[PDB]
């Protein structure tokens, strides 16, 4: 048999990790899995890195599809057999080669396509550019979330360092941003966190309130 | 057979604690665990202390690889048998030294290497130096977290006391920092907490607002 | 036979592309591919996407090692047979399971390790951060190089758009930088290229020389 | 045998010409060639007009895929047999209709999809809108490049004349653009080339430098 | 038979690496390889790392000597047999132990000595001390050449870093040297490259010409 070659599987993983879950991944999946066995489709789906929530919804949709097949359809393959959960590779090969054919691979591909369509319909891909500090969020938690996303980000080490240099100070709230810009660019992460530790405390609130009242009093 | 030695295990634990989960763990592990029965691998993994979340991820990854082996591969070892959970030492050695050999230890090493690579990729070590105080965080909760982290980390007692003296006051927000500096160095922990209890309350906030207003009025 | 797994190969590709050719590539290759046939090693080598020059030198190093093996060593494996070029999986499996065994996979792995060590020794990765306009380079050639590198760069589309927004004007030469800065942030790529189309022509050089001489005369 | 109809082939050529090597050609290629004999796939690939570099890229990718097939897989078809080079239509039809079937057409389609995906990943189309004069390029070579691109462009004669009237003067460098604008709309191509013959010569540089210094002196 | 020991081969490699291709290479090669078979001589020749051009000339000289031997002379050894390309170790041992002996190793050593003498005659080794920036060379190209030579240079990492901080700015052209000196020792490679990116452009030319003319006018 001609299963999924490593090149095809790696191209699938690359296209998924490059285009996230955009609609354009739906055609690519169908093209790279023509004639694929249900076990081959399961291997195709199981090698996706990240996107745990999307894979969870895809598995849930596959489960609903299998339940629907079990309800409508009373050896004869079942929903789990088509999905490959309880089915040997030899059984699938026999099913797709027996006369008359039972395209278990085609049915599984249809179910996976339905799940992919739903995901693409309501997905929302996170990114390092979408990590910004809240109006009242502490700077330490902002740095924690930013670095977690950066570690989850897909880029080279130098590009990640450039992201750290730029977006960390770019995407902070004005209260922390004014303090951060009041410091020199040479300031490292520890100094920035120490400077922004005070933001939100009673002392910082009193200081900003006093500055505002002094400015408005001097204006009038 | 020749199983793992106490010095081998001690060196493994020592490097794990020293480098936490630095990438150098990946080679060094493969410099000790090679040629070992998967039971020795399980002992190697379980002997470690701390990093419970990382060990949970590592176990989860081995579970995923065992499920993958059970799916692709239909006595012949199963995924749990290779993982060592449901395989005894005798049949384990028999599998290792069979004709043809079934490298159960090699496959378990590959799974553990995959899990360690994931951990190295997305895990950030926690240290006492990273424990600071939030802008609204009460001082008592800060001290509790500080002491919990201090007890968690390994060091000699003299270094622990030096850290307590030099870091607890230093890694505090300006509101607590001002009160702490206004107190004498001879002040103990109970005195420090008592003097810092009022921070964040109504009286302290009113007092700081009063100083800010007085400074503004005196300036102009 | 238990050949390589899709997850292991995916992880190998992931580490190769994430770390480029950092030294950390050598241990991981020694962990994922340890115990594999020469065909599996060839698959892992050929599957790696990008870095055409580095894979070329790896092929040259493997060829040199095979030639040395042929020169020293007079069915008995040859250099090409060990490298997998002129051998089948059945022949290799028989070789590593013969009495006495002939570790063809081990020798091929050693050759690949030597090649990877040489690459890590003298290979310098390229990145979009290293694309800077020359002092005499036309702006359009710089833009073409920048966009080619961006297309070759491993990043998400949003990150690539951010790179286009920032680095393209950030890495331009001062003569083009002045014009781009005077253009304003709202300028598009076509307008930016039109504005810098004359940098280096007789008119621009005459203008800048006249400005410099006017500054000198006004100073005097 | 139901081969590829002329309408399907011409539609494939039309979408390739109109959409270029945009992503939307992967879905279209799969839809029009679903069930195609490898000879039919080669006919679709060869009929594409233009895009010599991209077609060569696809040929190299198909060659690498055939080499991979030959390496992994020991009448039994070979890589060139799947690619359709060393195989007749009768042999491929018999392979498709054999028991068990050998989907050589599906494998060739997968290889072509892989090559198309790589091309779409890194291809960049060229158009007459991208033909601009360099800051030091002589006007005549710019006109030659512009007319070569215009001849290679797919458009009507009147549209091509309109772009000749507009873009040729629009996309010239500032030094030539000033002269062309001062010439007049009535000026033909020969007069335009004659007026821009001196751009870059000693006389033109002396003239522009003199004008710049005269402006500077008059300003002072 | 007593072949060449690893210590002798390592000493030969160290001598070549530390003396480059000084005349003292000839005596040491005559002392370490005295009595070696052509296979051992080929091992020492091919093992030498670096100096690709020198080894190419040595191979060319060996080929010329082999051609001369084939022309002058009518199993009976041949030129390639003396060079070890065609002959095996058993044949070489038989020739050296035949009555009368045929010292093919001695002839091959003479050919290698002739090649080494030619190399020592006309070979000039490159060093990081000879990497100087051209009068019109861009700074980034000079940096690339310097770093490639440094990577090829035999030294420790700390010494290489010291070379980076000293020679890179020490061996820059005066136009770039002035800007680098005006920057300061605190500047890193990125800031230095950004500052020197404008050297050799209309703005920099206008600036330096204006400075010189202002100096002349002030002097007058
Ligand atoms: C301010 C002054 C004190 C004096 C008072 C008035 C003045 C005079 O009466 O003397 C009018 C003439 C000028 C403006 C000088 C200043 C200097 C200049 C200059 C020397 C400037 C540098 C320029 O050099 C290049 O452009 C050379 C190169 C780049 C290689 C190229 O060929 O393009 C050239 C073109 C050679 C000019 C010639 C015109 C003069 C003499 C003025």
Author numbering:
A (entry chain C), B (entry chain B), C (entry chain A), D (entry chain D), E (entry chain P): 12 to 85, 97 to 242
From the primary publication:
The Gag polyprotein, composed of MA, CA, SP1, NC, SP2, and P6 domains, is the sole viral component needed for the assembly and release of an immature virus particle, which is accomplished by the oligomerization of Gag into a lattice structure at the plasma membrane.
BVM is known to stabilize the CA-SP1 six-helix bundle and prevent the final proteolytic cleavage of the Gag polyprotein, thereby preventing the proper maturation of HIV-1. To better interpret the averaged density, we modeled six symmetrically related BVM molecules inside the cryo-EM density (**[Fig fig4], left**), which was then compared with a surface contour generated from the symmetrically placed BVM molecules. This led to accurate positioning of the BVM model consistent with the “up-orientation,” where the dimethyl-succinate group is oriented up towards the CA_CTD_. However, the location of the bound BVM is more distant from the IP6 binding site and closer to the SP1 region than previous structural studies proposed. In this binding mode, the betulinic acid moiety of BVM is positioned to interact with residues ranging from I231 of CACTD to T8 of SP1 in NL-MA/NC VLPs (**[Fig fig4]**) or L231 to I8 in T8I VLPs (**[Fig fig4]**). The succinyl moiety of BVM may compete with the phosphate groups of IP6 for interaction with K227, resulting in an altered binding pose of IP6.
